[PDB]
């Protein structure tokens, strides 16, 4: 068999966790190459809806290999209890960690990161994919200071330009008003989330800081007021992304959407074509210190025992193993 397995890897360190997975730093033994490894437990895969998101995450990961600002896939494999995605390791850490250390970013830095995120999102949208979980934790910095979006498990695939979907999902701080109101929605919810993230970068706090029922109420009702020290163009771009009407929000018009972003005065100094080729030097260079650059990862993770949690045999033996037939994959472009 062509496929790799767990025994082809050395487990080095735990580097992250979210609601659905554990992420480890790993070494591919035969090549001495370092990767990240996303680990999902099969017991969490209950229904067809859970199989759906795993398969969607795999498929988006595959497509990610074609764009500079999305994390690509090296290989996929499984054991009795788990599913594994081996993906490229990005050792500058995430923007959550960056914001905790920096507190607030100059407009130029936010402009650079948001333009690269915009290009990543547009690539997904052009291909019929809504991202649906943009947040500080899901934006990674590479060694050179360019970003990559990761975590495709919330994605909706298969949407033609005017199509919509209706699943209530996302991260509450970043969830768009149209979702909270229960409307069918499109790519608009990603542009809203970018507005929130940009406000976070430039102001140093969420615009909705404050039970989640109360947060939802605030998102639906508050009109955001921009801190007076930001420039007119920075204020303008934030307000436009944070329009509560998706039909009027910047980036969301079905014909002019992404052009309206590119042409906004906030983004005037961006050469979009050079940027998408990584020919623009980043405004910040990550410090790669500690083994494998691990100092760029929160010590709450890097202090964890480097382990996959022992299985409950009674649970594992009841798992339908046929639903992941053909999960094994290796990227043929190395």
């Amino acid at each position: 068999s062509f496929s790799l397995g767990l025994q082809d890897f050395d487990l080095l360190r735990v580097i992250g966790r979210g609601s659905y997975a554990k992420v480890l730093l790993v070494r591919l033994k035969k090549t001495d190459r370092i990767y990240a490894m996303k680990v999902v437990k099969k017991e969490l895969v209950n229904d067809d809806e859970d199989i759906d998101w795993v398969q969607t995450e795999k498929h988006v990961f595959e497509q990610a290999s074609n764009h500079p600002f999305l994390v690509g896939l090296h290989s996929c494999f499984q054991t009795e209890s788990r599913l594994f995605f081996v993906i490229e390791y990005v050792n500058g850490g995430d923007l959550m960690f960056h914001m905790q250390r920096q507190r607030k970013l100059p407009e130029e830095h936010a402009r650079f990161y948001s333009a690269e995120i915009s290009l990543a999102l547009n690539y997904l949208h052009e291909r019929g994919i809504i991202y649906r979980d943009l947040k500080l934790d899901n934006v990674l910095l590479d060694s050179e200071g360019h970003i990559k979006l990761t975590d495709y498990g919330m994605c909706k695939e298969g949407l033609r330009p005017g199509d919509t979907t209706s699943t209530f999902c996302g991260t509450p701080n970043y969830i768009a008003p149209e979702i909270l109101r229960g409307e069918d929605y499109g790519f608009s919810v990603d542009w809203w989330a970018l507005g929130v993230l940009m406000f976070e970068m430039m102001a140093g706090r969420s615009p909705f800081d404050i039970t989640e029922d109360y947060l939802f109420q605030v998102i639906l009702e508050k009109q955001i007021r921009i801190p007076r020290s930001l420039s007119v163009k920075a204020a303008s771009v934030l307000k436009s992304f944070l329009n509560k009407d998706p039909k009027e929000r910047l980036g969301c018009h079905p014909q002019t959407g992404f052009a309206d972003i590119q042409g906004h005065p906030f983004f005037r100094n961006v050469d979009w074509d050079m940027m998408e080729q990584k020919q623009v030097v980043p405004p910040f260079k990550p410090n790669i210190s500690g083994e494998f650059g691990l100092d760029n990862f929160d010590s709450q993770f890097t202090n964890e025992p480097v382990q996959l949690t022992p299985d409950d045999d009674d649970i594992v033996r009841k798992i339908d193993q046929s639903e992941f037939e053909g999960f094994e994959y290796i990227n043929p472009l190395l």
Binding site: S19, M96, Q100, D133, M154, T167, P172
Partner: peptide, 20 residues
Amino acid sequence: LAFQREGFGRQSMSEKRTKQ
């Protein structure tokens, strides 16, 4: 303080994805 990883309002969720 300002940003809390997995703090209030910062956890991913979905009506179609099993958590925990």
